[PDB]
Paper text:
Bisphosphoglycerate mutase (BPGM) is an erythrocyte-specific multifunctional enzyme that is responsible for the regulation of 2,3-bisphosphoglycerate (2,3-BPG) in red blood cells through its synthase and phosphatase activities; the latter enzymatic function is stimulated by the endogenous activator 2-phosphoglycolate (2-PG). 2,3-BPG is a natural allosteric effector of hemoglobin (Hb) that is responsible for decreasing the affinity of Hb for oxygen to facilitate tissue oxygenation. BPGM is a multifunctional enzyme, functioning as a 2,3-BPG synthase, a 2,3-BPG phosphatase and a phosphoglycerate mutase. The phosphatase activity is responsible for the hydrolysis of 2,3-BPG to 3-phosphoglycerate (3-PGA), an intermediate in the main glycolytic pathway.
The crystal structure of BPGM complexed with 3-PGA and 2-PG has been determined to 2.25 Å resolution. The B factor of 3-PGA in monomer A is 39.0 Å2, that of 2-PG in monomer B is 63.9 Å2 and that of 2-PG in the dimer interface is 56.3 Å2, consistent with the weakest ligand density being observed in monomer B, and likely suggesting different affinities for the ligands at these binding sites. The 3-PGA phosphoryl O atoms interact with the guanidino groups of Arg100 (2.7–2.9 Å), Arg116 (2.7 Å) and Arg117 (2.9 Å), the amide of Asn190 (3.2 Å) and the hydroxyl of Tyr92 (2.6 Å). However, unlike monomer A, a significant portion of the C-terminus of monomer B, which partly forms the active-site structure, was missing (13 residues) due to disorder. Also, unlike monomer A, the side chains of several other amino acids located in the active-site pocket of monomer B, including Arg100, Arg116 and Arg117, were highly disordered, as shown by weak or missing electron density. The phosphate O atoms form direct hydrogen-bond interactions with the imidazole of His65 (3.3 Å) in monomer A and the carboxyl of Glu72 (3.6 Å) in monomer B. In addition, the carboxyl group of 2-PG makes water-mediated interactions with the imidazole group of His65 in monomer B and the carboxyl of Glu72 in monomer A.
Author numbering:
A (entry chain A): 2 to 254
B (entry chain B): 3 to 241
Write the structure that this text describes.
Amino acid sequence: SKYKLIMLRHGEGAWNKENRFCSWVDQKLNSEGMEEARNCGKQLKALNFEFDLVFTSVLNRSIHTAWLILEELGQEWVPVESSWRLNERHYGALIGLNREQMALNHGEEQVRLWRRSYNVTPPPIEESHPYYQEIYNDRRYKVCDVPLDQLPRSESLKDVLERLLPYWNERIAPEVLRGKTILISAHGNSSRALLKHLEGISDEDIINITLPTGVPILLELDENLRAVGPHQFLGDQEAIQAAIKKVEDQGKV
Amino acid sequence: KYKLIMLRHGEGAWNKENRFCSWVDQKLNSEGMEEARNCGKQLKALNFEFDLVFTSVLNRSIHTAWLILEELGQEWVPVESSWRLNERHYGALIGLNREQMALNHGEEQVRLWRRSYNVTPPPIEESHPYYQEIYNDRRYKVCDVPLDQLPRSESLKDVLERLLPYWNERIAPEVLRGKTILISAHGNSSRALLKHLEGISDEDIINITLPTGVPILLELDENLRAVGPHQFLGDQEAI
């Protein structure tokens, strides 16, 4: 049969205000990020969505986004399942740096390639990074399918897809085949990776997809779990276009 | 041996209005949330590190788990919810004023409905102002027993009988694997698991009083029987 699922990326926290690369640092939502989640929830309630399962990353800003949506829906009882495989892209040594400053030191166009291209890998994160130990000693990164030493230290979009797709295949997609209505609370680049796979977007074209924060993304799938058309945003068409331009402008002088 | 943490949510409006929530999905109030928040601060100050949490399907129990996990910075820990941890089903008593009931049917009878071990209250009926808010909710259309087979009132003993399979089948096997587990549940449903784990009689269980917002530690052996009486963690509270 036809299938329908919602994906979204969370709203803003402090480092978004400061225009810093956040990636695997576990920054909390701020007050307006929490409101963005509630607005998604209200939108989803206005369309009478009834979720059967929620999938999230292990970064708390994506879990809190999911809890906030469920509360607006009166669906706090719906199962939630979290995996590092949905984490934001690991940005290596760019973690914590200002974007517009990078665009100064290397050009607007080196920055765009670092952020949106499919294949270029960021400089790895090194033991001298102020947040190295906070990331890799965190107990949430033990309980899994990969030894702590084989966790990544930086990721291209391609690397994201390769550790994300096994989770889609083994956990998410079988529930979709089952007929359940699913919510994915993830991140900018882990959602771009999933969209690239489901929509058959080229290595070249994925560069041009920028996802707005805190906005529901409706995806329709066919009986082979491929997209029927392009992903669609729920909410006002202009306000969303302005919101996309914002994320694009973080990397511009 | 084994360590287990159980606890009970804080208050909402109806617990101030001296009323029966039961299976009605009443929300925490401000102190109800801050109580869970303070309770999470106390488990953090005790360096607690959970691997799995279990709740009922009522939001007062789920928010409580969520606020606690936020205080702990442990929001990534798996949560699992189940009606089998629900508060006791108070039947037709649901929603009624406690005092107004005391003048309708008498001190001694209302007291026996609330404190006994073996007495089933009057069933809730489709005329009840909250019958449809409960049995039409989608969270029961998707549970492990048919909707009609779910109870319309429960003795405290019925609570244990519906809880024990979930404990035997779902929870205890994870206690055995070495996981530090949290159970965010309700007064009655926590009373039934204690009675089972400690071995309390149908007589002592009726007088056991469990405070809200307080981590309740239970130490077990490999047969998962209590090594001693349940203990409260933290300090300085009354009533």
